[PDB]
Enzyme design. Structure first.
Site, PDB file in Angstrom:
ATOM      1  N   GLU A  99       1.985   4.149   3.966  1.00 28.34           N
ATOM      2  CA  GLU A  99       3.011   3.184   3.600  1.00 28.34           C
ATOM      3  C   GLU A  99       2.670   1.779   4.104  1.00 28.34           C
ATOM      4  OE1 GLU A  99       5.486   6.292   1.892  1.00 28.34           O
ATOM      5  OE2 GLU A  99       4.928   4.196   1.557  1.00 28.34           O
ATOM      6  N   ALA A 102       4.445   7.330  -5.388  1.00 26.35           N
ATOM      7  CA  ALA A 102       4.928   6.997  -6.723  1.00 26.35           C
ATOM      8  C   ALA A 102       4.056   5.911  -7.337  1.00 26.35           C
ATOM      9  CB  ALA A 102       6.374   6.529  -6.656  1.00 26.35           C
ATOM     10  N   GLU A 162       6.467  13.481   3.164  1.00 28.87           N
ATOM     11  CA  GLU A 162       7.880  13.413   3.523  1.00 28.87           C
ATOM     12  C   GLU A 162       8.656  14.583   2.924  1.00 28.87           C
ATOM     13  OE1 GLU A 162       8.022   9.283   2.020  1.00 28.87           O
ATOM     14  OE2 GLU A 162       9.099   8.834   3.883  1.00 28.87           O
ATOM     15  N   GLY A 170       5.387   9.903  -0.059  1.00 32.08           N
ATOM     16  CA  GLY A 170       6.543  10.758  -0.237  1.00 32.08           C
ATOM     17  C   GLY A 170       6.176  12.229  -0.230  1.00 32.08           C
TER      18      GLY A 170
END
Ligand SMILES: CC(=O)SCCNC(=O)CCNC(=O)[C@H](O)C(C)(C)COP(=O)(O)OP(=O)(O)OC[C@H]1O[C@@H](n2cnc3c(N)ncnc32)[C@H](O)[C@@H]1OP(=O)(O)O
Ligand SMILES: CC(=O)SCCNC(=O)CCNC(=O)[C@H](O)C(C)(C)COP(=O)(O)OP(=O)(O)OC[C@H]1O[C@@H](n2cnc3c(N)ncnc32)[C@H](O)[C@@H]1OP(=O)(O)O
Lengths: 239, 390, 390
Positions: free
Chosen positions: A140, A69, A120, A117
């Site tokens: 991350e 993001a 994920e 993400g």
């Protein structure tokens, strides 16, 4: 169509199979902003009601698949009280979990870069097909945090504790070859053939050739490692 | 008395140990090392006919290059053993050679052969243990990748049973000490087969001793060492662990009935054979499960065995075993009296029958009766054997 | 009747064969290929408890990289087999897997275990046979270096017993033909365990057949081929020789007494086991010395065996064996009726129990009683086994 947003489009296909494409109109890439999270939510609840669905193929319209993001929103989100933050992810993971508990075979067609993400998202699905020219990873830790969208939950149970610890502690990108060896991906194919690769896989899951219920189970239960094996698996990793 | 179906060990032999790094075997192939040893051990027993040798079961681990393509046969061809005899290479990591002994023994008891030639070899100098190793990612999904590193599996046990550095180094000095002592006092003479080798300058000479044995080993000399596996908090060092050594070990085995026919006096008689498994993370605890299943299959107890030979993998693994075997307080009386793997080296493929053979000598040299040959195996395994002097 | 000490084969399983070059196993580790097979074969027999599995004896030859460090255990850890069970990797080249069966069987007869899981694997795709091979010069002092090349040892026998090209290619077509026939008519259904693999495009799908089988094989297509080992005067080609194939084979074996306890119907009962040696230069003549020592140990004759399974190494080695076994004129009636290694491939480590397992099916499929599983081994060796249907 079944669903249509500004970043996600769920178009129906043959044999009941339906495709859910991540195409954020206007922007260059795809990422889990406030909008996408809400649209994916509706998309899931839509497929969760449509009885004509026989499978789900997650694709990407942009070059890359799905990246992290906006870094801008990260900071804005890391100021909120701990209680409000956890609630944001508690409800977020629910979205992916729903796509996971979906009573139907799901496969992700990783055509391009799938970071943070993005990976994920794929981890939530049952199967995963990847293009030889793509890369996946969980960068991350490059921000002082770790996978918050079920990453530290599905990866360790999918590719093994050790391999997971590495993919997370390093946050390094992973080539197609390595991604398959660790089983983070189920099959690698050329870019052009990646399309039929997902379709062919879906049909081989619906019929019963590929038990998708059994392949999804691992990340819904405790690790297979022994208690003694765990003691070492983690302590050595920590040290 | 001895039933014709029982197993008999005619003779034991082993090559002089040597440092894999610029040692006495730096220019000797594992194949020639085995063939040479096998040939020599067959000469001391001119009574047994090389032709009657049904099968040659050799022990080896890293089977590739020199040790690849069934080294058991590649060596039997350069001996007096006819091409009519068979040859298989058994691999079970550390307990490889010992498993070979069982394969033959059991082959005898079932009427599938009367005379066998067992043993093992491992030239770590050439075929290092780290050569050609491709880790399996999926293995982490069922176990801990760290469990693969033998050094770390020793650390875990050293913490589980509380073994301090002052204790591990104390066991190390004991090995070197007793090994050197037995060497000087001539105790390995009956088993050590004089073998040609090369020294530092590259001169050709015959060795009959063990280079691996460092007499200058003290509690102070080992205390100056640093942890070899775990930096902050480690207790196991290169001094407490076994050594990388090139070497083999042979053993002539046959049925008791054939022994009464060739009129050759036995050295020992196998009574019980056993193998067991444990968690890979703590493979050092393998001996106990193996010993138990062994004594039970022999209708005996740990108190019936007069002498014990426990392959000294790590100091942090041997002690725990002897403690849970209720024989720790009997160490200096019946456990590795002539030395251990810490001072004699640990050839992955030779160690199996190597310690078993030495055990037979410890019994014959001290009028013992029952002996125990056990050792821990990588990835959570154990193997034991019980020999009777009669 | 069956004495409690006899050996019993519960079930047999084998992975779908596949070309080592860009085949269905191009992305499957030999370790996972075995663990997956063992796990599946245990599922079909839910009656037997994985915990009671005393030891897992796997077969492998080029033990390095993927297949190194005791693959038997590296695979048993990714199955339902507890860490409490043991595991050893037996190597005897081509007859590796078969020797594993013997080690277990004999381990049962001597009360050293009640339940065993034997088998073998050989992923020649990844760990090719020419990988890490260091020839020993000294070997030429006791034998011929040429004897190492399996292809040439086939030529010699093809000249010694007079086997022409028109005969070798005739035997090849027979293998492909019968193999394809048995496949289509569903005869490998009970042994082939559906396994995931990948096709040309890289798609993921399950294979249940054998890629190695080329139905379009004719005497004309083979005649167009050229000698692969000896240019001027060669008779053996890649068409008459076995194939480089990735694949494994599993087999659950236990005592007869335990079978009468778990109430599970056997598949066959081991009667005689044997291994023998021949000249390395003519290793293809190994089956005969092994079969003889086998039949005698079973108090039988070649006329008592209803069906025979001879691993088709080379067409120039199989025919000579069947000729000296006085059963050549009985080929189409009791020899490789479902196909041979020339069409099913020859995984150095799997071929052992693979042909033996197929034999059991050929017997059960045609009301046979006694079966013969024999095969030639490199460097002059042979191994056989006799199973009884009762
Ligand atoms: C399960 C089973 O049955 S066994 C499992 C198998 N495991 C093993 O065999 C142990 C594995 N160990 C190894 O591979 C190596 O020993 C390692 C990796 C731990 C260490 O290797 P390295 O990094 O090369 O360090 P190295 O071994 O050279 O250290 C030895 C040093 O200790 C010193 N040393 C050794 N013993 C003594 C002693 N008794 N007194 C004084 N100094 C000593 C040496 O002089 C040497 O010092 P130097 O390097 O300055 O000359
Ligand atoms: C003792 C025992 O029990 S077993 C002994 C072990 N066996 C062996 O070592 C032999 C196994 N064979 C091999 O390793 C290899 O096939 C070799 C060494 C003989 C030849 O290898 P290569 O040089 O790569 O030639 P290759 O195998 O690719 O075959 C060459 C051609 O023959 C063709 N061919 C091979 N077999 C057949 C067949 N049965 N029918 C038709 N064509 C065939 C191939 O398609 C190929 O054609 P192409 O050139 O157009 O592609």
């Amino acid at each position: 169509m079944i669903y249509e947003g500004k970043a996600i489009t769920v178009t129906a296909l043959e044999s009941g199979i339906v495709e859910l494409k991540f195409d954020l109109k206007g922007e260059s890439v795809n990422k889990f902003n406030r909008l996408t999270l809400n649209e994916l939510r509706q998309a899931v609840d839509a497929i969760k009601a449509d009885a004509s669905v026989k499978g789900v193929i997650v694709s990407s319209g942009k070059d890359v698949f799905i990246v992290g993001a906006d870094i801008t929103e990260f900071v804005e989100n890391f100021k909120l009280p701990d209680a409000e933050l956890i609630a944001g992810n508690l409800e977020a993971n629910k979205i992916f979990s729903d796509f996971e508990d979906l009573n139907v075979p799901t496969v992700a067609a990783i055509n391009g870069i799938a970071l943070g993400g993005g990976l994920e998202m794929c981890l939530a699905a049952d199967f995963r097909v990847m293009a030889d020219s793509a890369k996946i990873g969980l960068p991350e830790v490059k921000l002082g945090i770790y996978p918050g969208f079920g990453g530290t939950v599905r990866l360790p149970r999918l590719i093994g504790v050790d391999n997971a610890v590495e993919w997370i502690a390093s946050g390094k990108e992973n080539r197609a070859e390595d991604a398959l060896k660790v089983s983070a991906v189920d099959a690698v194919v050329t870019a052009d053939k990646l399309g039929a690769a997902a379709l062919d896989l879906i049909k081989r899951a619906i019929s019963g050739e590929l038990d998708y219920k059994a392949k999804r189970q691992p990340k819904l239960e405790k690790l297979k490692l022994n208690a003694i094996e765990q003691m070492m698996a983690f302590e050595t990793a920590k040290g | 008395s001895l039933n014709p179906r029982d197993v008999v060990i005619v003779d034991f032999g082993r090559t002089p140990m040597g440092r894999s790094k610029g040692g006495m075997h730096r220019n000797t192939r594992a194949e020639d090392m085995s063939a040479h040893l096998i040939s020599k051990v067959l000469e001391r027993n001119s009574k047994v006919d090389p032709g009657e040798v049904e099968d040659v079961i050799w022990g080896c681990v890293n089977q590739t290059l020199e040790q690849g393509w069934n080294i058991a046969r590649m060596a039997s061809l350069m001996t007096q053993i006819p091409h009519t005899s068979a040859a298989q290479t058994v691999s079970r990591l550390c307990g490889s050679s010992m498993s070979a002994l069982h394969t033959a023994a059991q082959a005898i008891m079932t009427g599938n052969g009367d005379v066998f030639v067992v043993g093992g070899v491992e030239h770590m100098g050439h075929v290092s243990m780290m050569h050609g190793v491709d880790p399996n990612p999926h293995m982490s999904l069922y176990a801990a990748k760290a469990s693969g590193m033998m050094g770390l599996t020793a650390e875990m046990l050293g913490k589980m049973h509380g073994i301090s550095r002052e204790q591990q180094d104390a066991f190390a000095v004991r090995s070197h000490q007793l090994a050197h002592k037995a060497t000087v006092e001539g105790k390995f003479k009956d088993e050590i087969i004089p073998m040609q080798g090369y020294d530092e300058n590259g001169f050709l000479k015959i060795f009959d001793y063990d280079e691996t044995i460092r007499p200058d080993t003290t509690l102070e000399s080992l205390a100056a060492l640093k942890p070899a596996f775990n930096p902050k908090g480690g207790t196991v060092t290169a001094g407490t662990s076994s050594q990388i050594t090139d070497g083999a070990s042979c053993m002539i085995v046959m049925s008791a009935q054939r022994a009464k026919d060739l009129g050759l006096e036995p050295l020992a008689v196998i009574r019980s054979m056993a193998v067991a498994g444990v968690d890979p993370a703590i493979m050092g605890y393998g001996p106990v499960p193996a010993t138990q299943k062994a004594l039970k299959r022999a209708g005996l107890n740990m108190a019936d065995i007069d002498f014990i030979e426990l392959n000294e993998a790590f100091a942090a693994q041997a002690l725990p075993v002897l403690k849970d075997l209720k024989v720790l307080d009997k160490m200096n009386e019946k456990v590795n009296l002539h030395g251990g793997a810490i001072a004699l080296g640990h050839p992955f493929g030779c160690s199996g029958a190597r310690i078993s053979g030495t055990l037979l000598n410890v019994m014959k040299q001290n009028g013992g009766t029952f002996g125990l040959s056990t050792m821990c195996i990588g990835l959570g395994q154990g193997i034991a054997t019980v020999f009777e002097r009669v």
